[PDB]
Amino acid sequence: TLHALLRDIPAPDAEAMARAQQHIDGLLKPPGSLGRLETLAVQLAGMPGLNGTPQVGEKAVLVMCADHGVWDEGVAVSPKIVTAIQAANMTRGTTGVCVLAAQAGAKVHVIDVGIDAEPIPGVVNMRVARGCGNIAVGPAMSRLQAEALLLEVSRYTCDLAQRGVTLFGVGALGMANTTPAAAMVSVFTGSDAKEVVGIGANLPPSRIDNKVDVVRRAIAINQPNPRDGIDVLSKVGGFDLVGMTGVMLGAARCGLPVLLDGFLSYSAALAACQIAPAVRPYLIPSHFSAEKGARIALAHLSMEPYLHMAMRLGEGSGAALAMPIVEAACAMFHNMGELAASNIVLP
Amino acid sequence: TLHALLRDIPAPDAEAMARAQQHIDGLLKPPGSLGRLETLAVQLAGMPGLNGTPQVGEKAVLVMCADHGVWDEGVAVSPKIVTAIQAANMTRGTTGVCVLAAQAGAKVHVIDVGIDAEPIPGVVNMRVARGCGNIAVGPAMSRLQAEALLLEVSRYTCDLAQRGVTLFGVGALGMANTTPAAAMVSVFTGSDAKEVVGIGANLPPSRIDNKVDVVRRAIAINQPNPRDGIDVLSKVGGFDLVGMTGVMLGAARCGLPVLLDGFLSYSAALAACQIAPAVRPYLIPSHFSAEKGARIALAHLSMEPYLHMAMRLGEGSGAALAMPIVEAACAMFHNMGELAASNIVLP
Ligand SMILES: Cc1cc2nc[nH]c2cc1C
Ligand SMILES: Cc1cc2nc[nH]c2cc1C
Fold this sequence. Notes:
Two copies of one chain form a homodimer.
Chain A: H1 2-7, H2 14-25, H3 35-45, E1 58-66, H4 82-90, H5 96-103, E2 107-114, E3 124-125, H6 143-160, E4 165-173, H7 178-189, H8 193-196, H9 208-222, H10 229-236, H11 239-253, E5 258-259, H12 263-275, E6 283-284, H13 294-300, H14 317-335
Parallel strand pairs in A: 1-2, 1-4, 2-3, 4-5, 5-6
The complex binds 5,6-dimethylbenzimidazole (2 copies).
One 5,6-dimethylbenzimidazole sits between chains A (78, 82, 86, 173, 201, 313-315) and B (28-30, 344, 346).
């Protein structure tokens, strides 16, 4: 049950983190000198699914795919069918996340949570409906639907630990999805839509006003409660966004790290941390998205991404891009020598 | 001769870069959406040693090691012998750059350009002297010495292309070296020493004034000419700094990319670009160093690093950390599918 899942997310292990800090300070470098590589290694050490040390085994990027009724409001220049086309391209390894996941030695799990097309053979089927409701006139979905999807994706996510996965990445694929993401960021952070509505996939500068109006209208009509993240997801989110929140809840329940991607994923992370604050210590940023609302979302998560790539793709490519940085933190921790063994004494 | 080397650095290939841009725009994503991954792939395509396409073969991080007379001015809390000790640790794979270079699949070349100790078996010997002169009272070395070292390191660097290397990284190891680096950054950028003198390897906050005075005194007594980068290097730099400038000149002569590390490397890059502007298109930043003067140095190079890791080690570990990002740009370029083949038409 969702209540059980939320209640049983483990706290980070303070003892393992103290041991980790002490080992890091003792390595062959001035104390502190590897900066956020050091803080990352300690954060990893505290995640109970890593068994008391920073480590990476198998890596999985979960790509959540769905279509959105709000496409019909003129907020996206990408033809709606691109969601289905690109989801099928993920089976052939030709997409950005597939290619970057391969470079990083990660496997990609393509999960259809509500594409508006026939099912795609070889893609995991968790379809809620053929596209979610148009958030401009009503909700994306029912609360029951959002809850059922969270549970099922979090179970699928934590089940991957049984096949050796220790490091997740999350992403979303769905034309128009930077619209519900902007709506969710506005509701959770209390910023007006104008501060957090971006160009998504090359929206002409001249259609931004419309997209701002659409977000406002979505929040006005749905009245999502900012203190109930499942409410917000079901009313002004989408199936893909709910799907990414689900991955975060599952990694967290599993005591394992999850790398965010960009703006889409920040919205799902905001919902996830609202639903269960205990999720936060498991989240690791990758890059600082080009989308207008990225700063605000990241500030509300007190998060500072490692990578500044002006990226705005999603699908998980940014998460995959940051996997080698997590592995570098573990290599630092395990493979460096020690000051004492070289007889180096520093003040 | 150095004049020949400088004169014959090739210009970037505009034709290869146009072809690269066109191929990138055609791939399976909104145009522009992979941001600085795209601009990196185009920059790589223009480097004539890469044969008209972004690619990575073998990778080498060149670690330039030397001691500095200015240690005697009280500007470094690390015992001077650490340079020699850590240089020997590089032979055993226990240092940060060795460990991060291994993660990235790069080989480390340890080059002793003037350590104040007996030679270390198994380290490349290009020693100019046992430590350079104390820049507070006189020059680090003669012009002839700086020139000879530039030539020899640039030759060793470009010779690595014959063994398949296509991607270099640079770093330096030498106690007190953030002092001449700060002096060089001050001279090239025209910022007063106080704006660009950092804590280096954990200098107590209370000893910063002394280190500012030392830099000022070095520039006062030596009167390095900011429009003659070899002058600046020989007077207020060090052998390690000259050694990194040499790697940049050699990669550039070879038409190949070089990844900077942190503050030390920014100072050498400033000298390199002053000596030969044609070096600039070959340089690729890695991370944004924690050292106080990093911003100013990077602004003078119009450079925006990819990684924000609050790192301050050097030795090349930051360069090695960024190698997977260069490889990701190449994987994007070569392995993604195309819009046309999926019949996707965007405005
Ligand atoms: C241990 C040690 C390692 C280093 N590597 C580069 N600078 C250094 C300074 C110290 C003190
Ligand atoms: C081609 C294409 C690929 C994408 N991947 C994620 N969003 C996308 C939008 C488009 C248009």
